[PDB]
């Protein structure tokens, strides 16, 4: 009960965290209020709104009012990558323009 049952819950809860937390990727020291601004008129804006809640959860430890399971988020992620196409391959032209 104290070990592997909690350890399952530890990794289970860690699987609910954003992939930034799970990979230990960089996250900002403060949630920039200038970057989070949006027109509240496009699909990109409402994604940016929810993104602000994820950043608060990871930077401020201010969790969202609801958190979806890994199964719901994975089923949602599946719906993204089945739609997306023609994603750019890495090439020397990309290396040129990123340097620019």
């Amino acid at each position: 009960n104290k070990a592997k049952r909690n350890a399952e819950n530890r990794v289970r809860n860690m699987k609910m965290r954003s992939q930034v937390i799970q990979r230990s990727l960089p996250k900002p020291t403060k949630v920039n209020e200038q970057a989070t601004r949006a027109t509240n008129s496009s699909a990109d804006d409402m994604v940016k709104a929810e993104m602000s809640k994820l950043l608060a959860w990871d930077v401020d430890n201010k969790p969202p009012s609801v958190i979806y399971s890994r199964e719901e988020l994975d089923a949602a992620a599946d719906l993204i990558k089945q739609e997306a196409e023609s994603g750019p391959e890495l090439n020397s032209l990309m290396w040129k323009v990123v340097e620019q």
Binding site: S18, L25, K27, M51, I80
Partner: protein, 121 residues
Amino acid sequence: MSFVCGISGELTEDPVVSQVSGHIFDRRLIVKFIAENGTDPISHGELSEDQLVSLKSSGTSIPSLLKMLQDEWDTVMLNSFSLRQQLQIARQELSHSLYQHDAACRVISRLSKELTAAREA
């Protein structure tokens, strides 16, 4: 002939090829790579110091050569710094991209649940 090392990207006085990949290295770098990593730097297969096959093969002024070392060393360090700077930018872009993805999953999850209400109104 000019031979270019796959680790450094520079000419070598002692070109060596690895049988685990067929890429050409400076003997001294690859031995130090093996002695630290134990692997081929390009193919990531197991590699050892006996597996290297050797390839076949005026001055100007001492202050001039020392000034070439100075300018060249600043170029190598500029490369090392900009790699660290570009690496963190790559990590910052990546974490933002994952944040856009995870926020998009929250939106798609949210909307797909709200779309069930129209079947039970």
